Design a protein around this ligand. Structure first.
Ligand SMILES: Cc1cc2nc3c(=O)[nH]c(=O)nc-3n(C[C@H](O)[C@H](O)[C@H](O)COP(=O)(O)O)c2cc1C
Ligand SMILES: Cc1cc2nc3c(=O)[nH]c(=O)nc-3n(C[C@H](O)[C@H](O)[C@H](O)COP(=O)(O)O)c2cc1C
Ligand SMILES: Cc1cc2nc3c(=O)[nH]c(=O)nc-3n(C[C@H](O)[C@H](O)[C@H](O)COP(=O)(O)O)c2cc1C
Ligand SMILES: Cc1cc2nc3c(=O)[nH]c(=O)nc-3n(C[C@H](O)[C@H](O)[C@H](O)COP(=O)(O)O)c2cc1C
Ligand SMILES: Cc1cc2nc3c(=O)[nH]c(=O)nc-3n(C[C@H](O)[C@H](O)[C@H](O)COP(=O)(O)O)c2cc1C
Ligand SMILES: Cc1cc2nc3c(=O)[nH]c(=O)nc-3n(C[C@H](O)[C@H](O)[C@H](O)COP(=O)(O)O)c2cc1C
Lengths: 193, 193
């Protein structure tokens, strides 16, 4: 019981995903280096988060009105995702670049967790994040506005320890066995240690 | 028949939307200044575009396989949206900032229109955009990584004439009648003329 680690997968390419392969290598390496740690994984493609629309945005703010079933479900989901984030110490986010942005799968997660009065709040001296004491490790790809955006968003909710890892080709495609794993060990050595 | 104008709305706040109010003022002003022009409007919240997932990404690339009904529907939708874009000369995009990104409503549109071999293609000298001869006017808000992202994405598909307008408070909220409209006339004067 040294750290609780939450891994967020967002790729839409399932098991052939480069970033999912990297996330799995990360998990293996973390387990080996930190035997007592509790790792959990949320796959945002396998269990999609709904799109923030007019109906759902109303569910996420204080109202006091009766809510539709889908509103109730979104509010409960948001609460669950936020509790999950707060319960973990290390947040590993697999965020491949899709059309110069993050995957929508991850964006929908962000739109559920960014809630005023819950994960940030306004004070007399500006906004402050309420998700404190976290370490975030971002597994991404490069070719880049996604990186400063991730730093800004995570910072806004209180996460300033944000560490980016760029898959410089590791686990790209067809590869003799053992090779991607070894290359990933080299890549992830810094963040795992 | 001087220009064909396509307006894309993406706000989730419906008629109370600042950016929808601005888009409507834009339409009124454009109509007045360019009586012969054909304007059409696509509201990406009122008619949502599906999320790009594993199933839909497969529908958008050449395969030659049988496709699921939702894949067929996404391919047809993508084709329709792309034909619409190509058929218009002036593309007006209302893109308010939501959690430091564009609305998902607009992002899903982008994920349907960004297709290799259709709206861009690779050549021996790098990628080139295939949506040529367009003028894009972006109606947005400021507090900013959304702006360079929009320029990059639109540029990638071939649109280099990209003009940003920042609603410096215009049509924010409760307002005596006629005022937002007058302020919008001042704001939009440059892009309309
Ligand atoms: C729909 C789609 C869009 C993509 N867009 C970009 C892009 O804009 N820039 C880029 O460098 N790579 C892009 N890629 C490649 C991925 O970012 C690359 O595979 C990444 O390292 C891992 O993606 P994956 O984990 O989903 O396989 C795209 C891939 C897909 C499927
Ligand atoms: C680890 C790492 C982090 C980076 N973070 C940022 C960043 O926050 N903003 C940026 O514009 N570029 C960034 N870059 C690109 C130089 C980063 C590059 C690396 C290798
Ligand atoms: C003995 C041997 C067996 C290989 N078997 C495979 C294979 O089964 N499938 C595959 O995709 N690549 C295979 N490769 C290719 C490697 O995965 C890789 O593409 C290449 O050897 C890496 O060379 P590099 O480190 O200089 O980039 C094999 C390579 C060697 C030397
Ligand atoms: C869910 C949501 C998230 C928002 N996030 C931001 C933000 O990150 N930065 C900002 O300046 N304004 C933000 N806004 C305010 C809108 O960008 C502002 O109202 C914009 O000018 C027009 O939005 P609208 O057309 O949807 O009303 C947000 C509004 C909503 C509803
Ligand atoms: C009209 C206009 C366009 C702008 N375009 C960009 C841009 O493309 N990239 C950027 O970083 N800042 C941009 N900015 C912010 C300076 C822009 C500001 C204005 C007023
Ligand atoms: C005669 C008069 C009537 C107004 N009626 C309304 C109103 O019905 N509803 C409203 O929200 N604001 C109303 N306002 C306020 C204006 O919309 C606006 O908030 C303010 O007058 C703008 O002042 P400014 O240009 O210095 O910012 C009214 C203002 C005046 C002078």
């Amino acid at each position: 019981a040294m750290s609780k680690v939450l891994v967020l997968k967002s790729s839409i390419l399932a098991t052939s995903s480069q970033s999912n392969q990297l996330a799995d290598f990360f998990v293996e390496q973390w387990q080996a280096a930190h035997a007592g740690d509790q790792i959990t994984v949320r796959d945002l493609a396998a269990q999609p988060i709904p799109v923030l629309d007019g109906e759902l945005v109303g569910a996420l703010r204080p109202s006091g009105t009766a809510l539709t079933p889908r509103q109730q479900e979104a509010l409960a989901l948001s609460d669950e995702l936020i509790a999950e984030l707060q319960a973990n110490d290390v947040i590993v986010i697999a965020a491949p670049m899709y059309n110069f942005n993050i995957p929508t799968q991850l964006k929908n997660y962000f739109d559920m967790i960014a809630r005023a009065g819950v994960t940030f709040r306004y004070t007399e001296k500006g906004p402050e994040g309420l998700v404190t004491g976290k370490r975030a490790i971002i597994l991404t790809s490069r070719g880049d506005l996604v990186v400063p955006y991730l730093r800004l968003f995570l910072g806004f909710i209180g996460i300033t320890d944000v560490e980016f890892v760029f898959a410089e080709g590791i686990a790209y495609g067809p590869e003799v066995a053992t090779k991607a794993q070894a290359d990933a060990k080299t890549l992830l050595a810094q963040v795992v240690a």
